[PDB]
Design a protein around this motif. Structure first.
Motif, PDB file in Angstrom:
ATOM      1  N   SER A  83      -3.121  -1.284   6.377  1.00 21.03           N
ATOM      2  CA  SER A  83      -3.257  -0.095   6.721  1.00 21.03           C
ATOM      3  C   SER A  83      -1.520  -0.242   7.951  1.00 21.03           C
ATOM      4  O   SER A  83      -1.706   0.784   8.405  1.00 21.03           O
ATOM      5  CB  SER A  83      -3.957   0.138   7.702  1.00 21.03           C
ATOM      6  OG  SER A  83      -4.726  -0.829   8.381  1.00 21.03           O
ATOM      7  N   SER A 121       1.663   7.038  -0.269  1.00 26.63           N
ATOM      8  CA  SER A 121       0.352   6.104  -0.249  1.00 26.63           C
ATOM      9  C   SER A 121       0.484   5.411  -1.807  1.00 26.63           C
ATOM     10  O   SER A 121      -0.332   6.909  -2.590  1.00 26.63           O
ATOM     11  CB  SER A 121      -0.741   6.362   0.661  1.00 26.63           C
ATOM     12  OG  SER A 121      -1.416   6.337   1.259  1.00 26.63           O
ATOM     13  N   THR A 143       1.100  -0.799  -0.457  1.00 29.51           N
ATOM     14  CA  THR A 143       0.040   0.548   0.094  1.00 29.51           C
ATOM     15  C   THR A 143       1.139   1.240  -0.277  1.00 29.51           C
ATOM     16  O   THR A 143       0.235   2.119  -0.110  1.00 29.51           O
ATOM     17  CB  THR A 143      -0.572  -0.148   1.232  1.00 29.51           C
ATOM     18  OG1 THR A 143      -0.090  -0.144   2.451  1.00 29.51           O
ATOM     19  CG2 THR A 143      -1.870  -1.312   0.938  1.00 29.51           C
ATOM     20  N   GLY A 144       2.475   0.974   0.127  1.00 30.89           N
ATOM     21  CA  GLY A 144       3.186   2.305   0.040  1.00 30.89           C
ATOM     22  C   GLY A 144       4.467   2.148   0.597  1.00 30.89           C
ATOM     23  O   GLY A 144       4.684   1.207   0.672  1.00 30.89           O
TER      24      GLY A 144
END
Length: 330
Positions: free
Chosen positions: A268, A211, A200-201
């Motif tokens: 996350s 991100s 996700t980054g």
């Protein structure tokens, strides 16, 4: 059933990790490179061209009462680093850390490329990607994990690689004492035969998190972290004097530098690679130019979360009907 085996760096740089594997009856123990980016279990053997063996331990099928030639079967593989090997195939009993598979395809090398010969510490590879990548012809063979899966308490294996230290491969269970916090699971595509997922980054050092979706593979058989050129440039820009060297073959940096950490996203959650994990030491003995552990994937055609990334995490390879990958800090 379960299995648990210690995996040990081959050298002071963590260039690769070896795990002892018992093959045959009586057992012949070989130290194999467990590779989640390929799907062949192949070994140096009594059949390997003599001039291409230099210090490795060999498998001798004629000394195993459980070995059987897999008639007509051959194999041939080329790896992303340009190395290769090929040969014929036996089935035999293979055990890892107390977990036993009977009838495992053991691919006996007749030929290996120079890089294999020159590495005395690696007696072969044990592939842990999906069996669709297995190179045996005319009848494709299953990986050790695929053969073991139905018998395992849970259809999983875990990689817990150490930084400059031994670590562990477990089969069939998740050791809840081996990581901190929670495990974050993320989707896998098996379309290319790999444990392919989307980060996700990233962040560089104490910088802000960017991100952005980064598709790549979890590959215990690759030493370094290979990422898009944009990401890699952003990292090395934070190291004074770092540059990409065409002559050396990647980013180098002054050995006097202090490297920043690199963070990658898993959903996350965030996995932090300490700066020291990114140091691969002098480019040649005595040099003050050091080789970087984060390199561009441009022209590989795929991003690779190799050992530099994976050793910062406890990693779950979940081989349920719909496979997934899990990452925890540790």
């Amino acid at each position: 059933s379960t299995g648990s085996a210690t995996t040990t760096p081959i050298d002071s740089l963590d260039d690769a990790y070896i795990t002892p594997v018992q093959i045959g009856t009586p057992a012949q123990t070989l130290n194999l490179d467990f590779d989640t980016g390929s799907s062949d279990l192949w070994v140096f053997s009594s059949e390997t061209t003599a001039s291409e063996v230099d210090g490795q331990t060999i498998y001798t099928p004629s000394k195993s009462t459980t070995a059987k030639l897999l008639s007509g079967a051959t194999w041939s593989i080329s790896y992303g680093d340009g190395s290769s090997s090929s040969g014929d195939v036996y089935t035999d009993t293979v055990s890892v850390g107390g977990l036993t598979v009977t009838g495992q395809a053991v691919e006996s090398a007749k030929k290996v490329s120079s890089s294999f010969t020159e590495d005395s510490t690696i007696d072969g590879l044990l592939g842990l990607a999906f069996s669709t990548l297995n190179t045996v012809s005319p009848t494709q063979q299953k990986t050790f994990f695929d053969n073991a899966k139905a018998s395992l308490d849970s259809p999983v294996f875990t990689a817990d690689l150490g930084y400059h230290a031994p670590g562990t491969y477990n089969f069939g269970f998740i050791d809840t004492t081996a990581y901190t916090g929670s495990i974050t699971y993320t989707a896998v595509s098996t379309k290319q035969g790999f444990w392919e997922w989307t980060s996700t980054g990233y962040a560089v050092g104490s910088g802000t998190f960017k991100s952005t979706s980064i598709d790549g593979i979890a590959d215990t058989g690759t030493t370094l972290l290979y990422l898009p050129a944009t990401v890699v440039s952003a990292y090395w820009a934070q190291v004074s004097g770092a540059k990409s060297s065409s002559s050396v073959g990647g980013y180098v940096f002054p050995c006097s530098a202090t490297l920043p950490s690199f963070t990658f996203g898993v959903g996350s959650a965030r996995i932090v690679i300490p700066g020291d994990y990114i140091d691969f030491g002098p480019i040649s003995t005595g040099s003050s130019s050091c080789f970087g552990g984060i390199q561009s994937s441009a022209g590989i055609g795929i991003n690779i979360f190799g050992d530099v990334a994976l050793k910062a995490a406890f990693v779950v390879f979940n081989g349920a009907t719909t496979p997934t990958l899990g990452f925890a800090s540790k």
